[PDB]
Write a protein that binds this ligand. Structure first.
Ligand code: MG
Length: 355
């Protein structure tokens, strides 16, 4: 049994998902235990890189572990989708054309070294036992530790484009953009964009608002410290159709509150292989239809619906935080404190305005 620090980076696709999946792959090996996972780090490539590290225990030999990693790199399907490197193994020093441990660039890459030292604050490079790596890390300079984590409970950030959020000024439409930014900085792992509050809205106009914002998102891809997973919040079948046709590459999930056309909707999610949610307003009958039309069960969440993995939407809802003249600075606090409790529980996804 040896301890290895595995470095995991990615700047392509669903970034945090690729990282979670490489970790899942390793944990699933009968001869590997996962000891600890580092924080998530952002560095610049062209899209932003997402890097972390994991400390494992394993009876694998370095070269055999090298073999496993290339395998995993091909499973996740490797702008690199996934890059896996043996960063270190205790005080092990190994030089072979095949591999070097510690990794030759460990001490040149802050996105490698920072997570390592986070996992092993007392670690010294065995080739250079006198090198205080804290000093080196700082010399390497640039590195953003994100508030997004590899926790079990992912936080979905609400981005409403409807009339509720309207404060546009003479020459600026910046509020929803500012809102996306705040959410991403405060650690939302996911973003749920919906364009309806009120007076009904057409398919064409619902589509227009969603499209303009996704195109805006895409134009910002290399400017985001973290590229969140994207959930599309609409109950209209034709909206899904058009939005998925244009933007399926950057969408992770469809979140539909009202069921009509559930048949054609599943047929659409299946073609696109996307996550689906089930809200109230039994879940079984729906599940079966979805399951029927070709929707893999794991790709589907349920929501009980204040108004199979578990999504809960409870943000700024009075009925569930104890009802409602209360200000936003108070509504969030009941959410934020109740969020902090669902995380503790198993909760897979929580939908919130503030993290
Ligand atoms: Mg490599």
């Amino acid at each position: 049994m040896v301890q290895y620090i595995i470095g995991i980076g990615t700047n392509s696709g669903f970034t945090i998902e690729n990282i979670h999946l490489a970790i899942t792959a390793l944990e699933s090996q009968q001869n590997i235990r996962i000891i600890r996972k580092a924080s998530l780090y952002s560095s610049k490539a062209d899209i932003r890189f997402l890097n972390t590290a994991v400390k494992i225990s394993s009876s694998l030999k370095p070269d055999e572990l090298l073999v496993l990693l290339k395998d995993i790199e091909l499973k996740i399907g490797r702008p690199r989708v996934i890059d896996l490197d043996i960063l270190a193994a205790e005080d092990l020093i190994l030089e072979t054309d095949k591999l070097t441990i510690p990794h030759k660039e460990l001490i040149n890459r802050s996105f490698a070294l920072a997570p390592l030292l986070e996992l092993s604050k007392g670690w010294h490079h065995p080739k250079y036992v006198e090198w205080d790596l804290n000093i080196r890390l700082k010399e390497l300079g640039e590195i953003v530790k994100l508030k997004q984590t590899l926790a079990n409970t992912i936080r979905m950030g609400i981005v409403n484009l409807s009339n509720q959020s309207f404060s546009d000024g003479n020459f600026d439409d910046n509020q929803r953009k500012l809102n996306l930014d705040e959410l991403i900085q405060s650690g939302a792992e996911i973003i749920d964009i919906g364009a309806e509050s009120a007076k009904p809205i057409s398919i064409e106009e619902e589509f227009n608002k969603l499209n303009e914002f996704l195109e805006y998102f895409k134009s910002q891809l290399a400017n985001l410290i973290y590229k969140p997973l994207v959930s599309i919040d609409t109950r209209k079948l034709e909206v899904m159709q058009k939005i998925l046709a244009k933007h399926h590459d950057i969408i992770w999930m469809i979140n539909d509150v009202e069921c009509n056309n559930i048949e054609q909707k599943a047929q659409l999610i299946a073609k696109y292989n996307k996550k689906y949610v089930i809200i109230h307003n039994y879940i079984e009958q729906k599940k079966q239809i979805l399951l029927k039309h070709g929707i893999a069960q794991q790709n589907i969440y349920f929501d009980i619906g204040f108004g199979l993995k578990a999504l809960v939407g409870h943000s700024r809802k009075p009925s569930v935080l104890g009802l409602k003249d209360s200000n936003l600075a108070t509504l969030d606090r009941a959410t934020r404190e109740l969020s902090r409790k669902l995380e503790k529980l198993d909760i897979d996804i929580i939908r919130v305005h503030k993290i």
